[PDB]
Amino acid sequence: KRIGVRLPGHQKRIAYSLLGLKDQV
């Protein structure tokens, strides 16, 4: 399990928090 660099971080929570309200307003 030494491969986790391809996981979500803080930049994803933003792209999902914006498109989630900007699309589901």
Describe this structure in words.
Belongs to the protein kinase superfamily. Tyr protein kinase family. Ephrin receptor subfamily. It is found in: Cell membrane; Cell projection, Ruffle membrane; Cell projection, Lamellipodium membrane; Cell junction, Focal adhesion. This is Ephrin type-A receptor 2. This protein is mainly alpha-helical. 48% of the residues lie in helices and 0% in strands. It is built from one helix and no strands.
Using brief descriptors, characterize the structure shown:
TFE NMR; signaling protein; 25 residues; monomer; mainly alpha; rod-shaped; Ephrin receptor
Summarize the structure.
With about 25 residues, the chain is mainly alpha-helical.
For the largest beta-sheet, the strand count, sense and barrel status come to:
none
Strand content: under 5%
Q: Classify the secondary structure makeup into a structural class.
A: mainly alpha
Cα Rg: 12 Å
Shape designation: rod-shaped
Distance between the termini: 38 Å
Helix fraction, binned, reads 40-55%
Give the helices and strands as they follow along the chain: H
Alpha plus pi helix count:
1
Number of separate strands: 0
Family: Belongs to the protein kinase superfamily. Tyr protein kinase family. Ephrin receptor subfamily.
Organism: Homo sapiens
Protein name: Ephrin type-A receptor 2
Subcellular location: Cell membrane; Cell projection, Ruffle membrane; Cell projection, Lamellipodium membrane; Cell junction, Focal adhesion
